[PDB]
């Protein structure tokens, strides 16, 4: 019923050579990297307890994935006919997808653990239940990768004059569930093993970054302004509370209690909590941000800046009126053009600097360096570093595993049995699959190295680890 091809199924020898080189390099480098990670974790008995066990599980998944995926695909590219038997035809995809699941789940859980270790307002602590979590990860991985070991089989055929022994997921199946699995395996993999953890870790990372922004601006304004839980009359002669939250310009302390209760949602009697002050400060921050974007003098400057410099500008808009910050047309010009040091020297000459030198110096340092170094302590900074490293790792994953999934999706979406010259697309997909294997093994190889990349602790570990 389907006509044959005038064009053959072929792979150019140039791609064969270059891809074998790439695959061999990836294999050796990944073996070495994951083995060294495991060795330094094994010799590190003091840090054996902690989140290091998730690194151990991730490296184990990486090493297993490399060991199973690289040589068999090298052989499939070279010998183009395999003698290992239906035992291996069922065994290989099983362990392969099990290792894929181990890697995915362990990396996602590491990123979630890093979101947990940085945040506040948490539980008691991580200590013990994460090992049961490792058992769950490996068990769910092995269970999910079972339809692979059930549906694969070896078939033979006489093709254009040759007796071929093909190992594949059988296009016809005994179970009705296995038929649906053969139909939608690529969709299942693309959703669960790629889209799901990518989106979950992206949600967690966005949550973490917003939480960090709020807590850091709270720390900054606490240091610069001051935290008072009881009503007081500020310098300009008006009642306020919290972190400089004006209640009313009218001289009635009772009419100020009225507005305070109207804001907090309870009978306060002029006294609030540290966390209620934090919620009110978040409300004030959001109100300032919304007002700034309605000021044509301040809106493009705000839209130009990053998060930390936005927070410094919000600090300034807290201290002085919105029009007061609008009165800095020169320094705002320099900040919008990202001329940091010149804006610093121009702000250090203002009246605002001379009246409030401490706050001015810290805000100007924030503008120049673009960091929270003036306010926060080093524990928070190391936590941020580690979290951002793990997130960059999930990004490396999401970009390395995309081509293989996309090649499978293209095979599912564009193949038409009736086309005579479809074998062009077939050879194309062959090259794409042999490239996607390399990309996946490259991610699972660079996990330890890319962890070394943007983390000082793992840079030190990579420096020290040598022979044994």
């Amino acid at each position: 019923s389907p006509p044959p091809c005038q064009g053959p199924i072929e792979i150019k020898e140039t791609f064969k050579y270059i891809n074998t080189v790439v695959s061999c390099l990836v294999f050796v480098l990944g073996i070495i990297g994951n083995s060294t990670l495991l060795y330094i974790i094994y010799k590190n008995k003091c840090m054996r307890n902690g989140p290091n066990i998730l690194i151990a599980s991730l490296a184990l998944g990486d090493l297993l994935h490399i060991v199973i995926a690289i040589p068999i695909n090298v052989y499939k590219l070279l010998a183009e006919d395999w003698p290992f038997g239906a035992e291996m035809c069922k065994l290989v995809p099983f362990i392969q997808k099990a290792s894929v699941g181990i890697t995915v789940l362990s990396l996602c859980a590491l990123s979630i653990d890093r979101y947990r270790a940085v945040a506040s307002w948490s539980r008691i602590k991580v200590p013990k239940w994460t090992a049961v979590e490792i058992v769950l990860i490996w068990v769910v991985s092995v269970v999910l990768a079972v339809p692979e070991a059930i549906g694969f089989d070896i078939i033979t055929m006489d093709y254009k004059g040759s007796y071929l022994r093909i190992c594949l997921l059988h296009p016809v199946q005994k179970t009705a569930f296995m038929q649906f699995y053969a139909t939608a395996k690529d969709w299942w993999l693309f959703s669960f093993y790629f889209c799901l953890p990518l989106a979950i870790t992206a949600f967690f990372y966005t949550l973490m970054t917003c939480e960090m922004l709020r807590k850091n601006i709270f720390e900054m304004l606490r240091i610069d302004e001051g935290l008072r839980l009881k009503i007081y009359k500020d310098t300009e002669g008006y009642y306020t509370i919290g972190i400089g939250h004006l209640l009313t310009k009218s001289p009635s302390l009772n009419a100020a209690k009225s507005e305070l209760d109207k804001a907090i949602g309870r009978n306060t009697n002029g006294v609030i909590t540290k966390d209620e002050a934090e919620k009110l400060f978040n409300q004030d921050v959001d109100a300032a941000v919304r007002g700034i974007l309605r000021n044509a003098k301040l809106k493009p400057v705000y839209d130009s800046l990053d998060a930390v410099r936005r927070a410094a500008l919000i600090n300034m808009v807290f201290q002085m009126g919105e029009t007061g910050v609008a009165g800095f047309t020169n320094s705002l010009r320099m900040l919008q053009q990202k001329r940091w040091d010149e804006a610093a020297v121009n702000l250090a000459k203002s009246r605002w600097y001379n009246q409030t030198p401490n706050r001015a110096k810290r805000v100007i340092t924030t503008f120049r360096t673009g960091t929270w170094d003036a306010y926060l302590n080093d524990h928070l900074k190391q936590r941020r570093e580690v979290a951002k490293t793990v997130f960059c790792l999930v990004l490396v994953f999401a970009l390395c595993w995309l081509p293989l999934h996309l090649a499978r999706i293209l095979k599912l979406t564009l193949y038409n049995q009736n086309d005579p010259n479809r074998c062009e697309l077939l050879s194309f997909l062959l090259v794409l699959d042999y490239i996607g294997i390399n990309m996946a093994s490259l991610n699972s190889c660079a996990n330890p190295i890319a962890l070394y990349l943007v983390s000082k602790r793992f840079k030190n570990a990579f420096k020290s680890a040598l022979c044994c």
Binding site: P2, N73, K76, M157, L164, I166, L169, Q417, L430, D433
Partner: peptide
């Protein structure tokens, strides 16, 4: 890989040459 049915020999030869995934 897989194919829709066994009637297509070209996709079978593909999965003979294809990677194992």
């Amino acid at each position: 890989c897989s194919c829709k049915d066994m009637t297509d020999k070209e996709c079978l030869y593909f999965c003979h040459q294809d990677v194992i995934w």
